[PDB]
Assembly symmetry: D2
Homo-oligomer: 154 residues x 4
């Protein structure tokens, strides 16, 4: 009942196994020019296929939505809502995701977590009124999680 | 905004302490867990000695950030305000849900890898308050809290150790 | 050589197993800990299913890397070939050194945060081989091995659970 | 117990230098990561943070271990196949990633972003350390210095509010 809920929750906000893959493609496009955008997608599918990751996305977005619609007691409400730089509970879940496939993909998550290419740029809410404080972290975390797998099979 | 940011992030300790008290946890009963872990290695160890450390860990934003988020979900899941399937999963406190363990680690790391073993150790032996927080009969949902209470105890011991 | 790299990173498993044997640890013995960790909940648990789970853990590149590294270090500290002060810190299983626990956590994480609490727990009670590995008088350094065997049993444990 | 070992900050420092890395070189990386976010951020400020980090036992522990392996590897004293795996800096071997993340966590999760970032930019000594044709093994020190910078950088943030 999880593998599923995950993707519709992911989609429900505006993220697809597609743009996610567009990211994994960026992290290893230069190193694997010989590869299909489909390849990326399946690693992404396998990342999202593991419980620990799904176990998070729910928790992650649950807070994002819960903060956006703000039923959060203060100052937690404000903290999350303002994607506070000294607040790191989000990056923690992000880490568990990236950690699923091992140490190998850490420097990765940290690069797209700063830079923020593709949809990560969007999810940093360009004032979309929405709160993507956690997903912006779990998303990129899933990407680099896939980058670490993509290499574990090639 | 920029200054409202600083004000908010520098004023979490008091609130984090209150919530703990509001869920049944006392800095002292946590310190009680610290004596349980560090006693053996420290006969001379004082209860006040521990309290100090417990207070030390709690004075950390990373830990507040943890303590707040933890007791936040613990409540919504207790007031059934959470969406499904998160609501039930968290309310049930099932062994396949790990996030309640991912948060506790971030507290434990605050003082290093050394505290890892003690953490899992009291998370199993559930001595002191942990007993009450893991009790599913009380009607209260302590999915996250009994993990962070144990983590805080661990981290305090990790810090106590770094001091000796 | 890149093809040589593939050949190497793809063939670490049995080496990892041998090194464990050379250091006195058998898959069985590790399996026995998984037993201890899960027999109270699955009385009908067969030692076979335990082994199958421990083998699956060790089949992980991650674990293999941790095993080779930690044993390599115990071996070096044992033949006093490390440089001071690392040499004493590892040979004497120094109290504030957590590099061994850091390596273990990478094994535990292989199967999630669930196996964390079990790892710290067993990494305290020190049953089965752990008792030997911790001994401290056999003239053998097992500072890293101790933790990694504990970590594997705990990851195996977590896997067994995820399945049951 | 043999918990005994007091601060190894001074020894950690020497091992770093002896491997061609100064607190100053690491500080420069801290500037490179915070200079842009802080007006008149001074080098003194960078070195402080770098020193605060390097003074933590958690970090020291990582530094001694990481460097130690790098040394044994370039001297060809490890056991095969670990010897080649470490010497060749095998990308699928992540124990060095492990030790580095170790250093990062000493100062929160804010460092994860800079660790990755300076990891790819590879400025300053990171160019020397990452070379691969100096006949020197820096499989571990590489990540370690990148991590030390990240942590100090993270520390510098917390100590700004």
């Amino acid at each position: 009942n999880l593998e599923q809920t995950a993707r519709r929750w992911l989609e429900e906000r505006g993220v697809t196994v597609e743009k996610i893959a567009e990211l994994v493609y960026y992290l290893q496009s230069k190193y694997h020019p010989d590869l299909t955008m489909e390849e990326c997608i399946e690693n992404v599918n396998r990342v999202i296929s593991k419980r620990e990751v799904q176990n998070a996305i729910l928790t992650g977005i649950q807070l994002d939505k819960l903060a956006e619609d703000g039923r959060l007691d203060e100052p937690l409400q404000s903290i999350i809502r303002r994607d506070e730089g000294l607040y790191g509970v989000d990056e923690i879940l992000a880490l568990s995701i990236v950690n699923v496939y091992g140490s190998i993909g850490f420097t990765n998550y940290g690069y797209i977590d700063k830079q923020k290419p593709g949809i990560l740029q969007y999810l940093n809410d360009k004032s979309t009124g929405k709160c993507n404080t956690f997903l912006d972290d779990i998303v990129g975390a899933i990407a680099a999680a896939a980058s670490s797998r993509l290499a574990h099979r090639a």
